């Protein structure tokens, strides 16, 4: 089906009281922001997080947070648990509603990462929620590499014409070569060639990543993937399956160009996926992962008991056993059901099988694999 339904989380609720999001701090700051417990994942800025909180204390914290500035900390827990965190992301709330249900206090929340911080101290409060003294990392952008030695005479020959049509044979290599030769004409003053300066270019890395991502979807260049280097880098980082340590490493990166180069390197050096209790599995084909969502291959989704199963959508997978009828109670994708897919050796839960219901769609397949137990076994 379309790609705009798996981004509003209609399984959670329909009548969400939304808010216009304007809440930003200014670089160097010492601000105390609340930390929601029982959440353990790395949140890239710009990524949506759906929360369904049941415990009375967390509900009260969210109720107080809505009235004040709607922001809370999502600490990027390292390999060590028990508050052993050093970095994290601030999440702004824009969706919120309560449902008495079988009378407890249920609150459903949707929030997106906004800024990046490093923690200084983690003062705990006797109420059950812990605050966090955090310093906010600035979003620094470096100037153009040619601007340092750009010739004064050669400044008008820098505004290139827009992209003609899109993704046509001989419409990329022919134009990109001319762009490289014209923009980096001052490279001959220095002792480095033009292609080396093209390696550290802003738009060039964007287009290489776009070319290597077009194997996943058909999104138009003029939209979808944002033109902003920062937004593009974060969006690309939030939609790739590798281990947490590399998410923390990518989050630590300060400049957009360094992050873009790191994303290209990892994207070239990743080949397979594997179970995280076993030796091998068949999902090894990383080429067959398709984005049936506007948010990319992956997004964050919440089950009926609050647990946030981040899910990777794949078209084929083996070494999994399917148990149960195709139930569709709390389906994340409205048209399909789920049938809980286990592992074939270690008997560990890995994703679901989204069987279909109608004719003119994918009658089967579309497996959604959870990130928790996928080990990117790149040889």
């Amino acid at each position: 089906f379309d790609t705009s339904l798996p981004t509003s989380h209609t399984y959670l609720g329909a009548d969400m009281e939304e808010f216009h999001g304007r809440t930003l701090h200014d670089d160097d700051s010492c601000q105390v922001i609340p930390v929601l417990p029982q959440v353990m994942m790395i949140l890239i800025p710009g990524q949506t997080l759906p929360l369904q909180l049941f415990h009375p204390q967390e509900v009260s914290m969210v109720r107080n947070l809505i009235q004040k500035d709607r922001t809370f900390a999502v600490l990027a827990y390292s390999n060590v648990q028990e508050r052993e965190a050093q970095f994290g992301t601030t999440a702004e709330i824009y969706a919120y509603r309560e449902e008495q249900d079988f009378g407890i206090e249920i609150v459903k929340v949707k929030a997106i990462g906004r800024q990046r911080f490093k923690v200084l101290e983690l003062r705990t409060q006797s109420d059950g929620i812990q605050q966090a003294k955090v310093q906010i990392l600035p979003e620094c952008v470096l100037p153009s590499t040619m601007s340092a030695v750009q010739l004064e005479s050669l400044n008008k020959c820098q505004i290139f014409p827009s992209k003609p049509v899109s993704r046509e044979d001989q419409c990329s290599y022919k134009w990109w070569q001319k762009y490289q030769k014209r923009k980096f004409h001052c490279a001959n003053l220095t002792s480095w060639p033009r292609w080396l300066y093209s390696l550290y270019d802003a738009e060039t890395l964007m287009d290489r990543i776009k070319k290597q991502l077009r194997e996943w979807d058909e999104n138009l260049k003029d939209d979808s993937l944002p033109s902003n280097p920062i937004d593009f880098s974060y969006r690309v980082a939030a939609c790739l399956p590798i281990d947490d340590v590399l998410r923390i490493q990518l989050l630590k990166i300060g400049s957009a160009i360094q992050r873009l180069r790191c994303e290209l390197d990892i994207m070239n050096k990743c080949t397979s996926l594997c179970c995280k209790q076993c030796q091998e599995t068949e999902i090894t084909t990383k080429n067959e992962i398709f984005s049936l969502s506007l948010c990319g291959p992956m997004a964050a989704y919440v089950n009926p008991h609050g647990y946030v199963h981040e899910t990777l959508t794949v078209y084929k997978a083996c070494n999994l056993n399917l148990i149960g009828r195709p139930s569709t109670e709390h389906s994340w994708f409205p048209g399909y059901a789920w049938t809980v897919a286990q592992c074939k050796i270690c008997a560990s839960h890995i994703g679901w099988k989204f069987t279909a219901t109608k004719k003119d769609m994918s009658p089967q397949k579309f497996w959604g694999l959870t990130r928790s137990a996928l080990l990117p076994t790149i040889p």
Binding site: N303, H305, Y307, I323, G324, V340, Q342, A347, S348, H349
Partner: peptide, 26 residues
């Protein structure tokens, strides 16, 4: 009869559930 959590499975005997819930931990 039985239901599970975090994953959604179902088994027939209580002893089987005790095995399942431990596999989730490790």
């Amino acid at each position: 009869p039985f239901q599970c959590n975090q994953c959604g499975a179902s088994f027939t005997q209580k002893g089987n559930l005790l095995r399942h819930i431990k596999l989730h931990s490790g």
